[PDB]
Amino acid sequence: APADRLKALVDAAVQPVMKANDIPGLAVAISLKGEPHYFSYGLASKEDGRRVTPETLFEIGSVSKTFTATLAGYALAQDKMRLDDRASQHWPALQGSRFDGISLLDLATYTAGGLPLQFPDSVQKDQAQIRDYYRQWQPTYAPGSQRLYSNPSIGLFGYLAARSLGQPFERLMEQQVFPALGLEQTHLDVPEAALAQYAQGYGKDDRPLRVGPGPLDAEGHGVKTSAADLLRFVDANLHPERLDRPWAQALDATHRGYYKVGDMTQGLGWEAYDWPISLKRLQAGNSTPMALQPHRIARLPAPQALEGQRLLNKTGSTNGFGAYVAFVPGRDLGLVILANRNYPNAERVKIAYAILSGLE
Numbered sequence: 001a002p003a004d005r006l007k008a009l010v011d012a013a014v015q016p017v018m019k020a021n022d023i024p025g026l027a028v029a030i031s032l033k034g035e036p037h038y039f040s041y042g043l044a045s046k047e048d049g050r051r052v053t054p055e056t057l058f059e060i061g062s063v064s065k066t067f068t069a070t071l072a073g074y075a076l077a078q079d080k081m082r083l084d085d086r087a088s089q090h091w092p093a094l095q096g097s098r099f100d101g102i103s104l105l106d107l108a109t110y111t112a113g114g115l116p117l118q119f120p121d122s123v124q125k126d127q128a129q130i131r132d133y134y135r136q137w138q139p140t141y142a143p144g145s146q147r148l149y150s151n152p153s154i155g156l157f158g159y160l161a162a163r164s165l166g167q168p169f170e171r172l173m174e175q176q177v178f179p180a181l182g183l184e185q186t187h188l189d190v191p192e193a194a195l196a197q198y199a200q201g202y203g204k205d206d207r208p209l210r211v212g213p214g215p216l217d218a219e220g221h222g223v224k225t226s227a228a229d230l231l232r233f234v235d236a237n238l239h240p241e242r243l244d245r246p247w248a249q250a251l252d253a254t255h256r257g258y259y260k261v262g263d264m265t266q267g268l269g270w271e272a273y274d275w276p277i278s279l280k281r282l283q284a285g286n287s288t289p290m291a292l293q294p295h296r297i298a299r300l301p302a303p304q305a306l307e308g309q310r311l312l313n314k315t316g317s318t319n320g321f322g323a324y325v326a327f328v329p330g331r332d333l334g335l336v337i338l339a340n341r342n343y344p345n346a347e348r349v350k351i352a353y354a355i356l357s358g359l360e
């Protein structure tokens with residue numbers, strides 16, 4: 001039976017990796033030719049024995065950047081900003097700073113000139129500290145030349161997209177983006193009524209961890225969602241034409257590549273590969289050196305449509321959680337893997353590759 005074959009494929013991909021990485025709980029959701037399939041493993045909380053289900057809420061860390069990119073896509077569709085706008089055109093506090101010379105595209109795609117992975121520890125979640133951090137920041141190298149994966153970079157992109165729409169980022173996401181995408185189990189700030197669904201995270205020590213407040217955390221890494229809601233967002237990405245037209249345009253804006261580093265083409269949020277490609281190459285594109293070191297970009301002469309024979313993906317983590325999303329536009333195939341351990345990207349990609357190769 002096809003259902004027995006699917007469950008055997010997903011079990012064989014997931015179970016050894018959960019054992020090898022001591023993952024307490026893991027949710028898979030698959031979209032295959034317009035039908036969803038769910039597989040749930042292990043414990044949302046080791047302490048209280050709550051099992052993972054497709055409704056369990058996980059922190060998805062940097063997968064949040066695809067939601068940030070979608071809000072920016074909506075600002076672009078509404079003609080409220082353009083990617084070649086200078087960042088200081090959207091925040092007067094930045095006028096006179098080096099953000100006079102940095103584009104929204106540079107911020108979105110991590111090419112502003114060396115904004116670091118994280119805000120420094122000296123910058124708390126405080127509007128004045130964030131403002132002052134950007135006012136004083138000076139590039140290490142020319143804007144537009146080198147990719148250095150960065151929360152302050154795409155965080156400021158999201159913040160400025162929200163300013164272009166005249167409302168706070170968190171409010172726009174809750175009141176406009178999540179409803180437009182049909183997401184009722186997706187949160188920046190989990191309601192008290194929903195906490196029973198919120199999995200516990202387990203740190204590299206095996207200590208308990210849900211994410212603490214940080215500067216521009218909503219824009220960079222703040223989403224909590226279920227495997228079922230995150231697959232609804234994958235299905236929106238696979239079929240933008242099913243949404244009302246402004247939101248279809250917003251999703252299309254996240255499917256445009258601006259430059260290549262190795263095998264990876266960088267979009268807004270999404271990172272793309274040719275498909276098929278080897279597992280080792282997909283792991284290398286999602287490697288620690290790709291995330292932590294600067295890489296010279298190969299700029300495309302015009303944006304490339306991220307569609308057809310391609311895999312679009314994003315990794316995301318917090319101290320206690322590890323998420324991965326991948327989809328293949330030309331095959332109507334999508335995958336979500338949510339776990340309550342920050343386990344290596346390479347292992348997330350190994351599960352995903354086994355499943356996507358077996359769906360074929």
Ligand SMILES: *[B]([O])([O])[C]([C]N1[C]=C(C([O])=O)N=N1)[N]C(=O)[C]C1=[C][C]=[C]S1
Nearest residue numbers: 061062063151221315316317318319342
């Ligand atoms: B994201 O998920 O890419 C982003 C950056 N990041 C850091 C790590 C890591 O150290 O393993 N993984 N991803 N996520 C965040 O900045 C949120 C946090 C990462 C660890 C604690 S908070």
